[PDB]
């Protein structure tokens, strides 16, 4: 069974064919018709199994059938644990709703708070939101959420692990419950995701597992590379590594969609032939660029960590991790496996600052071996002078330089491993120096004894 | 008139109504007083009298009515300023519980 034979609207069907997706992946095939009927479902899928398309199809279909307008407010809420997974969901939702008249928007941590309230006040029908800033908007901002019809909880296990316990419970209290669809997607079935399910879902779920029980977690047959690199010289290391190890296969990882776009236009101005894979391209372009990479012999793909979870990495010689990784269990184990690539001799390295040497202690505690990689000072191609000249005189590449810098810092602060990676040991001057700036652009890092005779509040109206 | 009959008390005025009622507790702690007699006026016409013991003790709300003070010339009586009173209470003050904690205040 395929996308055509399930009866969709002509606006939904035409946008579906524009992406090139025809064949239903397994979770979409058996969870979209139950959600279209109106039954709440549970999903035990893995990130990148097409599950992002699995809840947006019933969400978009109900918006068009109920004929939502901006004055009716939010119809669907999709809760995503981190920023760049929400930015991927917002990317596919834009391709979905290209023929529709509904409105999509994104609420994320580190974004402009009072610009988002004006975005919400005008009317956003489909809202993808981080649970932290969702609760801030729900308690403080005036916008319509009284016509909500579906709630999506995407990677519910990752939401609980980050520490959004109290935010999840306060959200299900404030959002309306009567005649509401609910979806709960997760990977591992912990006890905490059971309490989240029993308080958000209707009393009869429709649960499906396809969770990969054959997790070949190897603790010995693995090897991880790492470079100690100064904060202001990380791009110069990436540039020198790519130009000297050119005519080879290299996959490089980043942390944000904005940084991938900025470094794509940088390397073309500096004349390195390199392929990019970020969220703002069309979906058909992404499959063409990945297929052209797989049946290539040499070259480089720039792609974020989040897009490469659901991506089947071909035989590559080098796996490059420029930014801190999203899930280090995902990182160390699986891309360490795909670095070996069955028979090939492939290696994977991790860029580390001197302020991130605590990752080594976690490596030694997990008993998985490491290999140092060192650089001479005469191999770094010092092109900082012409990089600063190009940023200071080109306005498009300056705009992408600010966006890549802000998206890197915001992702650094919203990291699970706060001990190894936190923003307060970064120096922003050297971080912006690598991004191409003389002076750092402004960012927000942050984004008992009580009163005498003060008793708790017995009652009253508060707002 | 009341503060002329309590030598163990001190006067204050212009307390911000937009402040919190437990900042009255901070105010009397600053001035070293364990009781407060608070006059709250509504509309510039309605008087509400608060009695409390400042750190932890109970609090009573009243609504004052039918006010007459010493400046009226028909009273024809006078007492030594700061002299010790004879407090006269009622039988119903003694029996009933909520008036009995009021008599303590």
């Amino acid at each position: 069974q395929e996308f055509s034979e399930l009866n969709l609207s002509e606006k939904t069907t035409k946008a579906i064919a524009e992406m090139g997706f025809t064949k239903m992946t397994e979770i979409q095939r058996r969870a979209i018709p139950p959600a279209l009927a109106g039954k709440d479902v549970l999903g035990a899928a893995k990130t990148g199994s097409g599950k992002t398309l699995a809840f947006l199809i019933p969400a978009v279909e109900m918006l068009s059938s109920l004929r939502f307008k901006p004055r009716n407010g939010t119809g669907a809420i999709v809760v995503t644990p981190t920023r760049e997974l929400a930015l991927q969901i917002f990317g596919v939702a834009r391709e979905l709703m290209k023929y529709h008249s509904q409105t999509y928007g994104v609420v994320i941590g580190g974004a402009n708070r009072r610009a988002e309230a004006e975005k919400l006040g005008k009317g956003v029908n489909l809202l993808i939101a981080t649970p932290g800033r969702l609760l801030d908007h729900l308690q403080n901002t005036p916008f319509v959420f009284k016509n909500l019809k579906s709630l999506i909880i995407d990677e519910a296990d990752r939401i609980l692990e980050i520490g959004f316990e109290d935010e999840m419970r306060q959200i299900v209290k404030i959002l309306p419950k009567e005649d509401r669809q609910t979806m709960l997607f997760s990977a591992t079935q912990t006890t905490k995701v059971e309490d989240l399910a029993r308080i958000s879902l209707r009393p009869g779920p429709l649960y499906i597992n396809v969770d990969e029980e054959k997790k070949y977690s190897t603790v010995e047959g693995l090897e991880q590379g790492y470079v100690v690199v100064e904060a202001d010289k990380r791009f110069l290391l990436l540039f020198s590594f790519l130009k000297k190890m050119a005519k080879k296969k290299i996959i490089v990882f980043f942390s944000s969609c904005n940084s991938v776009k900025y470094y794509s236009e940088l390397l073309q101005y500096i004349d390195l032939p390199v392929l990019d894979l970020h969220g703002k391209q069309k979906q058909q372009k992404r499959t063409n660029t990945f297929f052209e990479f797989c049946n290539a012999k040499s070259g480089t793909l720039i792609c974020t960590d989040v897009a490469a979870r659901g991506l089947d990495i071909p035989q590559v010689d080098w796996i490059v991790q420029f930014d801190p990784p999203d899930d280090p269990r995902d990182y160390i184990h699986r891309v360490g496996r795909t670095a070996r690539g069955n028979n090939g001799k492939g290696r994977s390295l991790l860029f580390l600052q001197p302020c991130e040497l605590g990752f080594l202690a976690h490596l030694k505690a997990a008993k998985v071996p490491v290999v140092e990689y060192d650089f001479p000072k005469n191999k770094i191609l010092n092109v900082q002078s012409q990089l600063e000249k190009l940023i200071s005189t080109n306005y498009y590449l300056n705009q992408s330089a600010k966006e890549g810098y802000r998206s890197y810092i915001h992702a650094y602060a919203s990291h699970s491993l706060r001990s190894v990676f936190d923003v307060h040991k970064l120096d922003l001057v050297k971080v912006a120096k690598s991004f191409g700036f003389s002076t750092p652009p402004r960012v927000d890092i942050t984004l008992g004894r009580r009163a005498y005779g003060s008793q708790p509040r017995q009652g009253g109206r508060y707002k | 008139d009341l503060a002329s009959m309590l030598p163990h008390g001190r006067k204050d005025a212009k307390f911000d109504t937009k402040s919190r009622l437990y900042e009255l507790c901070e105010l009397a702690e600053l001035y070293n007083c364990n009781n407060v007699l608070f006059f709250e006026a509504r509309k510039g016409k309605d008087l509400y009298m608060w009695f409390s013991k400042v750190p932890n003790g109970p609090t009573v709300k009243f609504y004052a009515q039918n006010l007459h003070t010493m400046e009226e010339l028909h009273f024809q009586g006078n007492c030594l300023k700061g002299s010790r009173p004879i407090l006269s209470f009622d039988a119903a003050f003694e029996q009933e519980p909520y008036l009995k904690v009021i008599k303590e205040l």
Partner: peptide, 29 residues
């Protein structure tokens, strides 16, 4: 001393706390 492999390591007052007449929370300063 990192016991678990890669999760975060786990990491005054002027009053006394005692219950009130409605079975709630009150304070003695």
């Amino acid at each position: 001393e990192i016991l678990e492999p890669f999760v975060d390591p786990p990491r005054d007052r002027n009053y006394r706390i005692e219950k009130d007449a409605n079975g709630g929370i009150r304070y003695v300063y």
